[model samples]
Target: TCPFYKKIPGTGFTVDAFQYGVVEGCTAYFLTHFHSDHYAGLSKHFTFPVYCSEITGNLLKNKLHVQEQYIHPLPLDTECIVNGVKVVLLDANHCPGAVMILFYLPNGTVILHTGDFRADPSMERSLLADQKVHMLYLDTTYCSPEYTFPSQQEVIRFAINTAFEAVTLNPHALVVCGTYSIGKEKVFLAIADVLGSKVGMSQEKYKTLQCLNIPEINSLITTDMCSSLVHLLPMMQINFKGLQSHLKKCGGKYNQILAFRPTGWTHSNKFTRIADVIPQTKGNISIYGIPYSEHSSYLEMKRFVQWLKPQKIIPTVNVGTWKSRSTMEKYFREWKLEAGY
Candidate 1:
């Protein structure tokens, strides 16, 4: 019954929700994305079957290493019932195969579980649809009023461009960027592929032409876990001096490592800093930094919320409700110089 995770209390449906700490009456759990916070709960005891997208299914089967029988993978625009609740999957551009679910009831009180989604016109055209959402559970992971992030495409561009510029300047110097290991894999892969092709001729860039065990990545992660493509001459999964050793040992070839760091890391005095992010390995190679992110900024969130024009918009997640409420109070009380709205 969480936001971005709609459930029909009468049917006791829990969509995209999991908590083993203390709970009951949650007959089924639906997972929307592959992020650990949303999917980690699947590892715990569940009273009923689970449902998720095919992409999410792949993550569970391949990454989480879970039994395939426990999940039901459906295609986009598919409609299915889990424990008597009707769920229609819609596009959410947060990540590959990420979706927003529509839970419908006979009473027409449709709930939109906008699981960590954005209204980016490039990726999500359905976000501003004319349908009414009785309830909206949003993704407030970075909903701080001052936080600003670029589009997913922009982040990928930054990662790829930064990697290319670094390598172009120092052909032998290893360039690396860090990101989470899950959905962010694609972001790094896009950058890696661009660099790999640029370094090698198109014939060498022919993915199938180069018969190698290299993996292709598109997750939010950036690390040495690049594809084993032989044509990808300058990419490897080596870390620290080992990566440098790989470069020194193998000439005419280079390695650009990618890793994950929180977007706020650069601004935080919190114990975990950039130094804490990169492995403590002394090396001769140079390092470069890129401040790219894959989520909508707080302004985007705010503007979209205003656009939705809900009669009673309940800002969910993070400290959104409190923050939005306080701001609204100021607008009516002090700014307007009026008694009330």
Candidate 2:
């Protein structure tokens, strides 16, 4: 029923997310990334062998406790055959170990599944460029014109600059950054490097980053908040009222606290004004929301589709079925035209 459940005609291979007891029938299974939503049916005690990126495999082994024998590592920009079908792994550029899958069919047609990726225009994708994709499973998370966000690097620069300004304006303040469980380590590293300070992380989170074996990132990790003023907290810490509770417990050590949430929801009209950092002052600390997103925007999607010119486009997030293919294309074309892409 989901987008990741695409079937390979005569082949028994299954793409991402083995759903509703289909694991037993799947000849080969693929995992795009370790995001909880992506690995929906995965478990620590999974019996079948699963294929994914090396970092994602390590995440399963170390974090989820999945056995090593059940994991098969996929290398980027490499092609491997499974069930007589040619499969290629390409960097998705969305997060660490995240990959986009390409399937070459027996009929010489190609199927491209972009597993929750942000399309990079500057990226060299000669392998994909050489072929015409027959079916494209797109990650249309931000498929509307209203969702505009800055580049990841620009957002990181703005966030680090804002953190510097906050510390410079008040050295007595404790800074907290909001990040997801797997991605967005660069933002924390940037703040840590610029401030010449370590980033405080939970024990479990610390271990996860350690498994990545990124030499530049290892130096920035701190076990406790007291080790550094700039703390890299989880997304849950930035929730309503958690900031106040955090400040009260550590108030003896610091005079004030500031929490920075780098997310796309801030620009979605659900939060404060659109800026580099939207400020919200509570009773104890100030929270800044920055629009940093890993998913592609509507503009990026339009550009990607225009370049791809796939024979068929399938929306991965909210998939729908209809009799006429032209009808689907008509509506999507209308959306692209209206969005000025």
lDDT of each: 0.52, 0.76
Model 1 poorest 10 in a row by lDDT: 204-213
Please provide, for model 2 over 192-293, each residue's C-alpha lDDT reduced to its tens digit, 9 standing for 90 to 100.
Answer: 778889988788778888877587775678787777887876788796578777777775887777777877644454443345346788655788777777
Q: What's model 2's lDDT at 300?
A: 84
Query: Could you say which candidate leads in lDDT?
Result: 2
lDDT of 1 by residue, 172-210 (tens): 544443434334444445755766632211332232212
Q: Could you tell me how far off, in angstroms, the CA of residue 207 lies in candidate 2 after the best superposition?
A: 1.5
